[PDB]
Amino acid sequence: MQEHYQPAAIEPAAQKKWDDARISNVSEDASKPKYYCLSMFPYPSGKLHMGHVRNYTIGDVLSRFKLLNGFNVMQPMGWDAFGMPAENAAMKNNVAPAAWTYDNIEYMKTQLKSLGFAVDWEREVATCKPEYYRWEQWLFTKLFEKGIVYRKNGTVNWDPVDQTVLANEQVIDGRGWRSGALIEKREIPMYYFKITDYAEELLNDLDKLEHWPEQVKTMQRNWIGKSRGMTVRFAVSDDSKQGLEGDYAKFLQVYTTRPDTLMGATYVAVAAEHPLATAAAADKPELQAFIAECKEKKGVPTGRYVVNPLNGDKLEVWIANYVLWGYGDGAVMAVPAHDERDFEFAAKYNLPKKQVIAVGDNAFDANRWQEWYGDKENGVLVNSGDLDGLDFQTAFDAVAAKLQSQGAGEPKTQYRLRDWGISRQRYWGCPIPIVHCEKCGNVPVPADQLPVVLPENVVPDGMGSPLAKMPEFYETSCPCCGGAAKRETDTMDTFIESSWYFFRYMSPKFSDGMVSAESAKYWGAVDQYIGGIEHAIGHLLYARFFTKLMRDEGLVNVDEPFERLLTQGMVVCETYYRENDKGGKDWINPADVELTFDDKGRPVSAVLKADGLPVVISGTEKMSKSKNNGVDPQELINAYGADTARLFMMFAAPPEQSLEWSDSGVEGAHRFLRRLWRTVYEYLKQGGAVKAFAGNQDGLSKELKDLRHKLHSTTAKVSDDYGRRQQFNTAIAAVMELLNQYDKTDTGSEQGRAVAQEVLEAAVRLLWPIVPHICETLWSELNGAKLWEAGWPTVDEAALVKSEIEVMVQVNGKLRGKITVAADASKADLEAAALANEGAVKFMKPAKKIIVVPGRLVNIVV
Ligand SMILES: Nc1ncnc2c1ncn2[C@@H]1O[C@H](COP(=O)(O)OP(=O)(O)OP(=O)(O)O)[C@@H](O)[C@H]1O
Numbered sequence: 001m002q003e004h005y006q007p008a009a010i011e012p013a014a015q016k017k018w019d020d021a022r023i024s025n026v027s028e029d030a031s032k033p034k035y036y037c038l039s040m041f042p043y044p045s046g047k048l049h050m051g052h053v054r055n056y057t058i059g060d061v062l063s064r065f066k067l068l069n070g071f072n073v074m075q076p077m078g079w080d081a082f083g084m085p086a087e088n089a090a091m092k093n094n095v096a097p098a099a100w101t102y103d104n105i106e107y108m109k110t111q112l113k114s115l116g117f118a119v120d121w122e123r124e125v126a127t128c129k130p131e132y133y134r135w136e137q138w139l140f141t142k143l144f145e146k147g148i149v150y151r152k153n154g155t156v157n158w159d160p161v162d163q164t165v166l167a168n169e170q171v172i173d174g175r176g177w178r179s180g181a182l183i184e185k186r187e188i189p190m191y192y193f194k195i196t197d198y199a200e201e202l203l204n205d206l207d208k209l210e211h212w213p214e215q216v217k218t219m220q221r222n223w224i225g226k227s228r229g230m231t232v233r234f235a236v237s238d239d240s241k242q243g244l245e246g247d248y249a250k251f252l253q254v255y256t257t258r259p260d261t262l263m264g265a266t267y268v269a270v271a272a273e274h275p276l277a278t279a280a281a282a283d284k285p286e287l288q289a290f291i292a293e294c295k296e297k298k299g300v301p302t303g304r305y306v307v308n309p310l311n312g313d314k315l316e317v318w319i320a321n322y323v324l325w326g327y328g329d330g331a332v333m334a335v336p337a338h339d340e341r342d343f344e345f346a347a348k349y350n351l352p353k354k355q356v357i358a359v360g361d362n363a364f365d366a367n368r369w370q371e372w373y374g375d376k377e378n379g380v381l382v383n384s385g386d387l388d389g390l391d392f393q394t395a396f397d398a399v400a401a402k403l404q405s406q407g408a409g410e411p412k413t414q415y416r417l418r419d420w421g422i423s424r425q426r427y428w429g430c431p432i433p434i435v436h437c438e439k440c441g442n443v444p445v446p447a448d449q450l451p452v453v454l455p456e457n458v459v460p461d462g463m464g465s466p467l468a469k470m471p472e473f474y475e476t477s478c479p480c481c482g483g484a485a486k487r488e489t490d491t492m493d494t495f496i497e498s499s500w501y502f503f504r505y506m507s508p509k510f511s512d513g514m515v516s517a518e519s520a521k522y523w524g525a526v527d528q529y530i531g532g533i534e535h536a537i538g539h540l541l542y543a544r545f546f547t548k549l550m551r552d553e554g555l556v557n558v559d560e561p562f563e564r565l566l567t568q569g570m571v572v573c574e575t576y577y578r579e580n581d582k583g584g585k586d587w588i589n590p591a592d593v594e595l596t597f598d599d600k601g602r603p604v605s606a607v608l609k610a611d612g613l614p615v616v617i618s619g620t621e622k623m624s625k626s627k628n629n630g631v632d633p634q635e636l637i638n639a640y641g642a643d644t645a646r647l648f649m650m651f652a653a654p655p656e657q658s659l660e661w662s663d664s665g666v667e668g669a670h671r672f673l674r675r676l677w678r679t680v681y682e683y684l685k686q687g688g689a690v691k692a693f694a695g696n697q698d699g700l701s702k703e704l705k706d707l708r709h710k711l712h713s714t715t716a717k718v719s720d721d722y723g724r725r726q727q728f729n730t731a732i733a734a735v736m737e738l739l740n741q742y743d744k745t746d747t748g749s750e751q752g753r754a755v756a757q758e759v760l761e762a763a764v765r766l767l768w769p770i771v772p773h774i775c776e777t778l779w780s781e782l783n784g785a786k787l788w789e790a791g792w793p794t795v796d797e798a799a800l801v802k803s804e805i806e807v808m809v810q811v812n813g814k815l816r817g818k819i820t821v822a823a824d825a826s827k828a829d830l831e832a833a834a835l836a837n838e839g840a841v842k843f844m845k846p847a848k849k850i851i852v853v854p855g856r857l858v859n860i861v862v
């Protein structure tokens with residue numbers, strides 16, 4: 001065994017040894033239980049950084065742990081190669097989108113392979129190749145036939161910098177998720193996935209996700225934004241139906257999320273476009289002056305009345321500016337004693353306020369809005385007839401019973417969520433499989449003629465959709481009539497691919513469907529998913545929707561894609577930038593910046609070392625490829641070795657917690673790896689290997705007994721930490737503690753060396769998921785078997801039994817007590833414990849003499 005710890009020697013070798021054994025290349029093996037552990041795959045938007053190390057070392061640790069426990073482990077990796085992140089990274093580097101993506105993919109494969117991750121590279125996938133995206137083209141056409149995908153004009157979010165429309169999930173604080181520019185409103189046709197159709201299931205199936213962080217689940221609940229309301233009809237009075245036709249003559253329909261207040265409505269409000277507004281203004285020009293005014297909070301009375309269904313009150317109808325014709329009903333009711341928006345409006349014109357809710361008994365002031373009025377949680381109903389005394393839940397159902405039995409209403413559910421707009425005016429994206437024919441309409445491309453192949457030799461000129469200036473691409477024949485027609489030039493958003501790729505990993509070479517039935521039946525769902533919480537509202541919602549879509553088609557048979565979700569905390573570091581002449585920002589790596597400090601130690605100035613000219617200091621921020629603040633793992637592997645990169649990131653903090661970059665933390669992770677190497681080498685220099693201690697330990701010294709206790713305690717604690725707590729920093733700390741006691745333990749005797757062997761064989765296996773290169777090498781110097789067949793270390797709980805004795809206690813001869821003591825518990829602690837529990841102190845004045853038998857009995861004399 002060499003004595004210097006040289007990563008560049010042992011690390012490539014260990015990777016070659018794992019690769020040759022094909023340990024990470026798994027198939028649908030029914031003899032082993034399956035474990036699908038997946039980390040969120042990267043965009044080719046630059047170099048990987050130490051945040052990615054943390055992300056994927058977490059995954060690798062969980063996979064390697066389950067592999068050592070006999071599981072059949074699939075840990076795949078691929079590339080989110082389509083869409084905006086790879087294209088923008090390509091144009092900022094003035095490279096063709098295809099050329100850049102394929103080059104960055106190979107650099108990221110190089111970067112990841114130097115880290116020794118146990119990845120099944122035979123399932124590698126690049127979402128920009130036709131053999132991938134043809135299958136989402138196929139799913140598009142099928143859904144389009146059913147109308148689950150549809151095209152429609154409407155108001156959309158427009159990113160002026162990326163020159164494309166985004167989905168509502170791609171707008172972050174009114175700005176583009178990639179550009180950061182303010183989003184404008186525009187009316188553009190778009191292809192939508194009808195995600196509102198699945199709004200109820202996506203909300204209710206979050207209750208199934210017991211191993212998801214509750215933040216992700218509540219954030220998706222608030223994004224789906226469910227509200228249970230009530231459709232309510234107020235009949236038009238027998239003397240206001242002038243000019244009204246159809247249903248608009250007989251009733252005024254409104255919506256309300258507070259149907260419990262219905263007995264308190266004192267007037268209604270109507271839209272200028274609502275038909276009762278037009279017949280009321282037909283002979284009243286001042287009403288048409290308001291109808292022309294907007295079409296702030298203003299309103300006019302109309303003198304036409306509608307009847308409350310629940311008590312027969314005749315309420316006056318108001319033209320109001322806050323009733324946007326597009327409400328669904330275009331009209332509301334107004335309970336001003338319990339809605340702030342309505343109390344303000346009905347103080348503007350002195351309308352009445354009847355109170356119908358009491359909270360405990362907060363006194364009711366008619367012209368003084370108190371916050372308890374809108375309490376939908378701690379209130380019971382007042383002045384409401386047989387609805388008196390009900391709470392909000394019970395009064396909801398009772399109003400629905402009332403309204404439905406007379407037909408005047410019914411519950412109606414609304415969602416803040418809107419359909420998913422996936423069209424993009426961009427080149428580097430999966431082509432949309434539609435052909436517009438002047439005779440047949442928007443027709444899908446037949447399954448036999450898929451994929452519609454995106455040409456890869458294009459460079460965007462940065463001036464609109466490049467495919468739309470390419471008649472060689474869009475001029476085609478109609479699939480239905482043979483006539484001339486044009487291809488859809490918009491492409492699919494990048495979140496299409498990432499919504500199903502976890503299935504593609506199960507059969508990436510399958511050429512007849514999205515995923516083959518035999519492999520989807522085997523791999524089931526992703527057992528473990530690891531990725532940042534920033535995906536809560538977009539990807540982690542999209543992927544549940546797609547999974548349900550694929551299930552309803554018969555491709556998969558799971559309801560949810562990811563059983564366990566671990567959201568790792570962000571590695572953060574400094575970030576700098578300049579402002580470019582295009583109004584944007586040019587981000588700069590802290591390694592190209594030279595700082596100037598204050599007298600107190602604060603950075604004051606920062607200049608780029610290339611030109612000495614200043615740069616702006618942006619402060620600590622998440623390590624990001626798009627903000628050019630990453631620490632490259634290859635620059636650490638070359639200097640310190642891959643294991644040090646891995647050990648530092650699993651040790652600095654618990655996986656969920658924020659981690660700040662520091663050079664001290666890298667040196668420390670290395671000195672421990674030297675300590676591990678030095679420990680195994682020194683043990684081997686003074687004797688060589690021996691058969692690890694096992695079996696009964698009667699006869700071992702107390703000191704080595706204590707060590708075996710520390711040993712199997714640690715194995716138990718590391719096992720609990722990998723596979724229940726999923727806390728890796730504390731698994732590493734426990735092994736250090738084990739090594740601390742080993743350093744303090746004389747292990748030179750024949751039995752001591754057998755215990756040293758047992759400890760070291762255990763330690764390197766315990767740390768193999770975290771630092772596999774150094775452990776695999778050390779294991780081979782200690783033991784000739786294959787590490788992954790020796791398996792995960794077992795806890796020998798015989799070694800956990802404490803070394804104790806139970807001595808007799810007597811008073812003047814006759815036995816009256818029994819006490820527990822340590823093995824080497826001195827006669828003073830013995831005699832003190834003997835004269836300190838029941839039998840001796842209840843039959844005792846002090847003792848005249850205490851004769852002690854060494855480790856047998858102690859007799860009190862009185
Ligand atoms: N600083 C970081 N710390 C921890 N995890 C990170 C960090 N940056 C990215 N990740 C995670 O790595 C995975 C891949 O992210 P991605 O490919 O978007 O890289 P990125 O650094 O975010 O690049 P970009 O800024 O262009 O999006 C995701 O699970 C993401 O949450």
Ligand SMILES: CC(C)C[C@H](N)CO
Pocket residue numbers: 040041042043080498535539
């Ligand atoms: C699963 C995907 C949405 C993750 C992206 N490729 C990186 O954030």
Ligand SMILES: [Mg+2]
Pocket residue numbers: none
């Ligand atoms: Mg990202």
Ligand SMILES: [Mg+2]
Pocket residue numbers: 208210
């Ligand atoms: Mg369950």
Ligand SMILES: [Zn+2]
Pocket residue numbers: 437438439440441478479480481482483
């Ligand atoms: Zn046609």
